[PDB]
Amino acid sequence: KVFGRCELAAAMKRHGLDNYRGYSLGNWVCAAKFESNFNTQATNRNTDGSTDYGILQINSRWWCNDGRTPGSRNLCNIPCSALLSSDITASVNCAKKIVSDGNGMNAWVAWRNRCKGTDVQAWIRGC
Ligand SMILES: [Cl-]
Ligand SMILES: [Cl-]
Protein backbone atom coordinates (compact mmCIF):
# COMPACT_ATOMS: atom_id res chain seq x y z
CA LYS A 1 0.00 0.00 0.00
CA VAL A 2 0.88 3.66 -0.42
CA PHE A 3 0.34 5.61 2.78
CA GLY A 4 -0.81 9.16 2.92
CA ARG A 5 1.45 11.49 4.89
CA CYS A 6 -0.83 12.02 7.88
CA GLU A 7 -2.00 8.40 7.74
CA LEU A 8 1.59 7.20 8.11
CA ALA A 9 2.37 9.77 10.81
CA ALA A 10 -0.55 8.46 12.87
CA ALA A 11 0.48 4.83 12.40
CA MET A 12 4.13 5.57 13.22
CA LYS A 13 2.99 7.40 16.37
CA ARG A 14 0.85 4.43 17.46
CA HIS A 15 3.92 2.24 16.95
CA GLY A 16 6.02 4.39 19.29
CA LEU A 17 8.33 6.25 16.90
CA ASP A 18 7.56 9.82 18.06
CA ASN A 19 10.75 11.01 19.84
CA TYR A 20 12.15 7.47 19.82
CA ARG A 21 15.87 7.57 20.66
CA GLY A 22 15.69 11.34 20.28
CA TYR A 23 14.02 11.55 16.84
CA SER A 24 10.71 13.38 16.60
CA LEU A 25 7.96 11.90 14.43
CA GLY A 26 8.59 14.25 11.51
CA ASN A 27 12.03 12.69 11.02
CA TRP A 28 10.45 9.29 10.46
CA VAL A 29 7.75 10.56 8.09
CA CYS A 30 10.33 12.50 6.06
CA ALA A 31 12.56 9.41 5.99
CA ALA A 32 9.73 7.26 4.64
CA LYS A 33 8.80 9.82 1.99
CA PHE A 34 12.27 9.97 0.51
CA GLU A 35 13.20 6.32 1.10
CA SER A 36 10.07 4.58 -0.33
CA ASN A 37 7.65 7.34 -1.39
CA PHE A 38 5.38 5.93 1.34
CA ASN A 39 5.07 2.56 -0.49
CA THR A 40 5.32 -0.49 1.76
CA GLN A 41 6.52 -2.61 -1.22
CA ALA A 42 9.44 -0.50 -2.42
CA THR A 43 12.60 -2.50 -3.05
CA ASN A 44 15.99 -1.40 -4.37
CA ARG A 45 19.03 -3.51 -5.26
CA ASN A 46 22.52 -2.30 -4.28
CA THR A 47 25.98 -2.79 -5.76
CA ASP A 48 27.08 -5.01 -2.85
CA GLY A 49 24.36 -7.60 -3.61
CA SER A 50 22.07 -6.38 -0.83
CA THR A 51 18.55 -5.05 -1.28
CA ASP A 52 16.66 -2.38 0.67
CA TYR A 53 13.10 -3.43 1.63
CA GLY A 54 9.84 -1.68 2.43
CA ILE A 55 8.59 1.65 3.73
CA LEU A 56 11.90 2.37 5.52
CA GLN A 57 14.22 0.63 3.02
CA ILE A 58 15.81 -1.73 5.51
CA ASN A 59 19.01 -3.32 4.23
CA SER A 60 19.58 -7.04 3.74
CA ARG A 61 23.31 -7.00 4.46
CA TRP A 62 23.08 -5.84 8.07
CA TRP A 63 19.48 -5.90 9.26
CA CYS A 64 17.06 -8.39 7.63
CA ASN A 65 17.67 -11.76 5.98
CA ASP A 66 16.72 -12.16 2.29
CA GLY A 67 18.68 -15.35 1.64
CA ARG A 68 20.64 -13.89 -1.30
CA THR A 69 22.96 -11.29 0.28
CA PRO A 70 26.63 -12.09 0.99
CA GLY A 71 27.87 -11.19 4.45
CA SER A 72 24.36 -11.13 5.95
CA ARG A 73 24.15 -10.38 9.67
CA ASN A 74 20.34 -10.28 10.22
CA LEU A 75 20.65 -8.03 13.26
CA CYS A 76 16.88 -7.45 13.34
CA ASN A 77 16.27 -11.23 13.25
CA ILE A 78 13.53 -10.93 10.62
CA PRO A 79 13.08 -12.15 7.02
CA CYS A 80 13.17 -9.21 4.62
CA SER A 81 9.93 -10.49 3.07
CA ALA A 82 8.04 -9.57 6.24
CA LEU A 83 9.11 -5.96 5.67
CA LEU A 84 6.97 -5.77 2.51
CA SER A 85 3.72 -6.12 4.48
CA SER A 86 1.19 -3.30 4.36
CA ASP A 87 1.33 -3.43 8.18
CA ILE A 88 4.36 -1.48 9.35
CA THR A 89 4.95 -3.41 12.61
CA ALA A 90 7.97 -5.41 11.42
CA SER A 91 9.59 -2.41 9.71
CA VAL A 92 9.12 -0.20 12.80
CA ASN A 93 10.51 -2.85 15.12
CA CYS A 94 13.60 -3.20 12.97
CA ALA A 95 13.95 0.58 12.59
CA LYS A 96 14.00 0.87 16.38
CA LYS A 97 16.91 -1.59 16.51
CA ILE A 98 18.75 0.24 13.70
CA VAL A 99 18.43 3.69 15.29
CA SER A 100 19.64 2.28 18.64
CA ASP A 101 22.83 0.83 17.13
CA GLY A 102 25.01 3.92 17.65
CA ASN A 103 24.74 6.22 14.61
CA GLY A 104 21.11 7.35 14.99
CA MET A 105 19.13 7.87 11.79
CA ASN A 106 22.30 8.17 9.70
CA ALA A 107 21.59 4.58 8.56
CA TRP A 108 18.95 6.08 6.24
CA VAL A 109 20.80 7.75 3.32
CA ALA A 110 17.69 9.62 2.15
CA TRP A 111 17.10 10.97 5.66
CA ARG A 112 20.73 12.04 5.97
CA ASN A 113 20.74 13.82 2.63
CA ARG A 114 17.21 15.18 2.29
CA CYS A 115 15.67 15.46 5.80
CA LYS A 116 18.41 16.16 8.34
CA GLY A 117 18.88 19.87 8.94
CA THR A 118 15.42 20.80 7.60
CA ASP A 119 12.33 21.67 9.62
CA VAL A 120 11.08 18.10 9.85
CA GLN A 121 8.08 19.02 12.01
CA ALA A 122 6.48 20.26 8.79
CA TRP A 123 5.94 16.59 7.86
CA ILE A 124 3.38 16.19 10.68
CA ARG A 125 1.81 19.65 10.40
CA GLY A 126 -1.94 19.52 9.82
CA CYS A 127 -2.31 15.90 10.98
CL1 LIG B 1 8.47 16.36 14.31
CL1 LIG C 1 13.10 -12.66 2.32
Distances (CA, A) of 100 to 6, 21, 32, 70, 107: 25, 7, 18, 24, 11
12 close to 99: Cβ distance less than 8 angstroms: no
What does this entry list as its resolution, in Å? Answer: 1.2
In sequence order, the 6+-apart residues with CB closer than 8 A to the CB of 99 are 20, 21, 23, 105, 107
Method: X-ray
Per-domain residue ranges for the chain? 1-127
What residue type is 120 in one-letter code? V
Report the binding-site residues. Answer: 101
What residue type is 12 in one-letter code? M
The dihedral over CA atoms of 86, 84, 101, 5, expressed in degrees to the nearest 10, equals: -40
Report the binding-site residues for substrate. Answer: 101
Is there a catalytic annotation at residue 87? no
Residue 24's Cβ-side half-sphere holds a number of Cα atoms within 13 Å equal to: 12
Catalogue the E-assigned strands of 2-127: 43-45, 51-53, 58-59
Q: Is the dihedral of CA 74, 75, 81, 84 positive or negative?
A: negative
The ligand minimizing its distance to the Cα of 122 is 1
Answer whether CATH 1.10.530.10 is correct for domain 1-127.
Answer: yes
Distances (CA, A) of 20 to 27, 71, 84, 103: 10, 29, 22, 14
Task: Give the separation between CA 72 and CA 88, rounded to whole angstroms.
Answer: 22
